[PDB]
Amino acid sequence: AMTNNLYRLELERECVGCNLEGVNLPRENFGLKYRIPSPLVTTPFGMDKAKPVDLTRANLSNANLYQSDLSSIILENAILVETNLSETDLENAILIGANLQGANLENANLQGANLENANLRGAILTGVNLEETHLKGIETDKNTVWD
Ligand SMILES: [As]
What we know:
little secondary structure
């Protein structure tokens, strides 16, 4: 049940293999940079001992993650076809073997992110921060947009 998946995400910080196709989770915080204990109380302190959200083999196709924090997230072998990842924070994220076909990553931050063997066919990466981003083995095509 979706309710159970959301619980595992909020509490267990994971949802391996979950089916989250088309979910609407914009502006959420699934990263390791900050925490909100009043949405301005946001602070990085207290994150020294926190685990990264695990979404290995998860299906987030066509899901909306607009402006969500996904820093250090684990999306290994995840399915993200046509997913809205624009303006998301994917710093140090693990996207090994991820399927990002037709995904929208506009203005997303991918610093230190690992996208080895990831599929970027038709994906849009305009304005993306590729500083120290591992792009070894990625797949692209005439539809892949970089600018
Ligand atoms: As190609």
